[PDB]
Amino acid sequence: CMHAFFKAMLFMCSGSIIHSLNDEQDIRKMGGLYKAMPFTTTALIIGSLALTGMPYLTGFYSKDLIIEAVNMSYTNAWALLMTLIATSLTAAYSTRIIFFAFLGKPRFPP
Amino acid sequence: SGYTPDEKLRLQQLRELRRRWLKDQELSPREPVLPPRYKTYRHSIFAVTHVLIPVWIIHYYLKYHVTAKPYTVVERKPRIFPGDTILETGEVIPLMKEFPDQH
Amino acid sequence: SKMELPDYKQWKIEGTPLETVQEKLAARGLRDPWGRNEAWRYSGGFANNVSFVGALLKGFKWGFAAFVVAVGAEYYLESQ
Amino acid sequence: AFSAPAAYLTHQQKVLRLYKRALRHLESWCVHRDKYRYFACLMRARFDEHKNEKDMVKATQLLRQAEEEFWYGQHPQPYIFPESPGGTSYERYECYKVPEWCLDDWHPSEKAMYPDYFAKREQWKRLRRESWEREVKQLQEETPPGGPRTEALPPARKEGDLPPLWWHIVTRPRERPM
Amino acid sequence: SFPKYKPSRLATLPATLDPAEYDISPETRKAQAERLAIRSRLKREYLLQYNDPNRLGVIEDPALIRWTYARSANIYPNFRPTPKTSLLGALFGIGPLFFWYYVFKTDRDKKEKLIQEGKLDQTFNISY
Amino acid sequence: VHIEPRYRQFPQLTRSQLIQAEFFSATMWFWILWRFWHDSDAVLGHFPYPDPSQWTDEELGILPDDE
Amino acid sequence: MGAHLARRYLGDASKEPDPLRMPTFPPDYGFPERKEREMVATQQEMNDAQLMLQQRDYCAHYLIQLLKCKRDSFPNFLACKHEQHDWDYCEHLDYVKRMKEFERERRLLQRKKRREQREAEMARG
Amino acid sequence: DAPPLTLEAIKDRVLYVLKLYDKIDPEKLSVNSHFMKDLGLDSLDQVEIIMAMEDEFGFEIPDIDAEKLMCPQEIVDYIADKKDVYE
Amino acid sequence: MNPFASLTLTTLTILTIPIMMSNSNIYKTNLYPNYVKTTVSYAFTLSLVPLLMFMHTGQEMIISNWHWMTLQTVELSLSFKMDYFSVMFIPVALFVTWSIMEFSMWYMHS
Amino acid sequence: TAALQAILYNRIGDIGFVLSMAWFLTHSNAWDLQQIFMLNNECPNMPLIGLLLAA
Amino acid sequence: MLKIIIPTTMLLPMTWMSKHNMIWINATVHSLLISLISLSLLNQLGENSLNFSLTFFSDSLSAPLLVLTTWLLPLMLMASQSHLSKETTTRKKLYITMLILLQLFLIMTFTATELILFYILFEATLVPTLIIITRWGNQTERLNAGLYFLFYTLAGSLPLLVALVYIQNTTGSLNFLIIHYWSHPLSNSWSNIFMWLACIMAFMVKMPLYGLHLWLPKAHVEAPIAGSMVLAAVLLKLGGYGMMRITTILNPLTNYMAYPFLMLSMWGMIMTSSICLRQTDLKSLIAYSSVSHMALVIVAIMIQTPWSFMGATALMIAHGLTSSMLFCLANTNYERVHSRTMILARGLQTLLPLMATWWLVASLTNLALPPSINLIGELFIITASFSWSNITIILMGMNMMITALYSLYMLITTQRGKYTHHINNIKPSFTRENALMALHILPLLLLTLNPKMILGPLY
Ligand SMILES: CCCCCCCC/C=C/CCCCCCCC(=O)OC[C@H](COP(=O)(O)OCCN)OC(=O)CCCCCCC/C=C/CCCCCCCC
């Protein structure tokens, strides 16, 4: 349920960015959208924070419990390690999306 | 290295023809000659039909046809807790024993 | 309708990282002729941008004030 | 796509295409504009360094070395324009392109729905039918006895003529038909 | 220098890395001109028939006809029984049959042995 | 509202979208702070984790080794 | 995660407890008089409450009380803090009892190792 | 969606880019000036100009066609013809 | 009768309704997207109601309304299991679909 | 190509799903959750792996 | 059964006495009337069959096939009237007469109560089919196709005649009721093995079995549209009906003689699906799809369980309808461009929208998409084969994957993509063609609504 919510919102924000930049789906060509598009920017930031497990957002009430259950159970050690690394890489690619889509100088056509 | 004179001339002529074709593609003010033959009101008309009629039909189907054969609609039995009142028989499900309370 | 292109004489690499690139190239003995055509991006309303930590704190200024006001209201209501 | 290809690419054409492709992939690597400008100026400096070479054998060897270096150093996921062959928007509107021969099969009522357009369409059809013999005669006059050695086509050498083989070039579907 | 690229069957050699593209003999240029002339003649024929105003139908493609004929009707007359053909036919048309027969026969023999020994869980197995 | 396209210039913005974005960001941060104020045990925990090395053999039922 | 895994794997599995075989010693070994755990909720009460079989532990009575409080105060879904805390406290006590069992098993195992080593030394001497 | 292009807009944008080029003097630049013959550029400069126009208009001009665009008017005509601009 | 089964089956049926209207002048006109979106919103609320019913007393049911065929001792009938999973997933999916359909009204205009 | 690829992978999943359905019918005389849960007190590897492959 | 047989024998004089411009109208109207009359046979009993007289009887297996034949005749009439506009009146009447004779022989075949009469009629079905193929086929290969079809079927069927007369001499009767009530076990001996071989091989050739199928691509590709429609819809089901009827007396020898046929059917189902993946001809693709489906039916019949027979009957009916629809669609596209190459005509989705919708629905029904009766029959057969053994699931899953792959490959190649530039004679779809597709598809969905009507006596 939680992932449905915030992932749908993230995809909608991505589609809004694509439509605004004339069917451009490359973060290497996006940029400056933090001030170019305020509302989609704040919506995407909120979605990314919820996805990465912000301490009291929608993704906190599922992902945090999932991670605690993985740590506290009779699990495979390699599976637990890969789950933790996957959480870190989730934060990593959310950072990549925000950094290359909203921060910096524009790279879209004039 | 560049257009030959024949290539440039042919391209110019083709461009003129293409632009003329597009201009002809542009429509006329009367071109689509068709043959002769409140918001709350629309919300109300939509709500009565699309919601009211199907719910009427479904309730009639369930109450008088589906719930006429055994086991068609089976509700999970309600949860009964101690210190409760069973409504069918006026029964009193008693409380639990004393708890060994901690702080 | 009928938009007009802004005057092309205003695009200058000065004050932008393209000037630093030009200085590096000049030290190398080189020059890049496309400085201004890229310098449209580094001026105007795009000159000031927010860092990643600043982007996450978009509404923290008003959020913290509202939180303090709400905490005070709750404390006063609980007291009386 | 509008130019008839030659039988081969010259050395200058090869090196220019390599230059453009290397610049594009470098821009893919150097996302930021100032960094891309710096490294593109360095790349053009390399090309200028090798610009003057009397030994064409050595020039071909340098071209081969540069091609190998590019293939090693290419971006695995280069930037492609949306409408370009590798782009995300490539061939999206090919299903909306409908031809005028499909157009002329309409019912009389559908044709009557648009009276003025079909008059100009009939004028275009008359122009096409009144010029085909001249076009084919011009084509067969200019071609060598052996046959066409290239895909190039001649212009209209006369005042009252149209360039041969023009109908589908002129009447090709619009880029955004619907 | 840089690591070499090894072409494969499903990842072919790029044109820019082909050594034959940097050793161009004058004969190669003549061959390229001949190929371009052939392509140009075919293109001219197709364009004439395609821009003919009076044509109403499909431009027959002899290449397509040859392809569909060779793929379908010209296979048997050119078939000769060789050791390679015989071995490949025997393998691909017999081996799978006997392999599956062995597998299913062993499975059913084990099932019947369990049924006779009366230690197979057949409870609730009503539908068959 | 009709927004005129810009050429090489920052696009035209609207006070409505500006204030909406600010309001929703402030709403998110207010919710986060308000929740962390009230139920902080959802992040920091609520019950101490015992140190098993400080449990005595008396209460763990371990007899002396010599006995 | 934890130091116990490191001790058992990169060390003496003989001195570290086996989670699948624990306990390996009699319950009264070292306890002169030991009291059985008290269960408040009855089988009929748990069955009527329809607690999940994973939830029918010794802390089931607090769970039943929490469910009853939650059902009665439906629109106000924030009125069961005390019952939730009681259930969580009972679960915490159960978990620390399990931790005590693990520690007891570990120190009993190492005590047995010391005893058998001393007996072997006595036999050798 | 997007406003349609016009011949005047295409010409203005290509002249804008060429005047922002630093190897071309804007005063001696006209829509009919040739890159090699009367502007003094070379093949690499023409390639850079074509790449700049590709960036400007958001579409790729193939290398076989890009080599023949030796004039701003030729570039305007090519872009308008590809984009179906007739007014 | 308990409103549970009636409301759940009604949400499903009203989801199906606009498909029956796909051979009409409303499908021929440009009001069909807004019509479908309004239907989805109405279904979302009508499915929120059984969610409220479950959140109070935890009611779950199965509805084997129509008997399809009896294969000897195996009976196949059109049965719907309205349990916690169904009554929680349906409102979330309908909310997401409503938002997506409005976003598509904006995004797919051309 | 993307549509056909999705169909192919989901069809392998459907292979798993059909395996699970066939096993459940053969060894439980029903295709519904109530009887599946009643009869399968300790569910076996073949149906559970079929379900896992489908998922 | 005379209330259905006699109206066809009256359709013959109607065809030969109608006016030159009314033959198609009269034949279509009265064929639809005969189909409506024959719908009454679907009211079957739960204990025994419908024994009308000493000669004809109807069963829960015979009724759906008879209804399918009576419904298929007018569709063949529509397609034939499409492609036979320039023929003379006498030859049109002869073609309609051939179709009527084929329907009459099929009805008498499915209703025959005795094995020898069934043999006579199901052999008599060859003559009208051979005449139709070798006379109104378009290509040069129609003669070779007819020769292959005729000689495969007859080489299969002559030992069946010898076996039937031998069984009559040994037991006293070939009546199906007698041979079912008086059936005796078949002892394991060479004589019984060869009797089993004669009967089963005749019907396997009719099915066709893998390794005995070449006549099917040859005939189906080179026959006219009506011939292709009747060859796949009904004539392929004669083998399955015969095997269901004849296996009463072949037990328990079927438990041991079925291994080679089961292995052939399964592996050849896989092989023919793979062949469909790489076919350059659309009619050949549809023919090999038919081969795969009938191989699945063969597997069901050979494993011979009550759950397999129901799935076999459902799959037979569903495959008949789907194959007829696919052949009709291919024939429409052939009439557009006068060639059977699959990649010649593309972009038909953007050239003919509603025909693309018909293509999509036909392809969806070709693969087992629930709750279609195709899926019902296939799933029943797969479950019965799983009960038989637990690697049949592997084979069936591979077959289903390849089936979806080649169905959607055909759909994408024919419809999706960009249209051929030089093909400019693709006129808008005719009302007749669209009505033909609708009449092909709607009964399939109605049978999906009511599935027990095509599950056979075992239901
Ligand atoms: C149980 C049955 C066996 C299951 C595995 C069998 C695999 C058989 C492979 C199917 C053969 C393919 C037949 C024709 C398919 C269509 C033709 C085709 O190749 O499609 C091309 C298309 C294009 O590729 P793109 O990456 O999109 O590049 C596009 C660039 N423009 O590629 C595909 O779609 C093929 C995708 C499937 C290929 C096979 C991969 C499957 C192998 C994995 C099996 C292992 C599963 C492990 C299970 C783990 C879970 C327990």
Ligand SMILES: *P(=O)(O)OCC(C)(C)[C@H](O)C(=O)NCCC(=O)NCCSC(=O)CCCCCCCCCCCCC
């Ligand atoms: P215009 O017609 O004036 O063009 C001048 C040309 C180049 C045609 C000359 O007239 C000419 O032919 N000169 C001699 C041939 C020659 O210049 N050969 C050498 C040129 S290739 C070369 O030197 C390339 C070396 C550097 C670039 C290599 C690219 C590899 C880096 C790419 C990495 C991938 C990601 C960045």
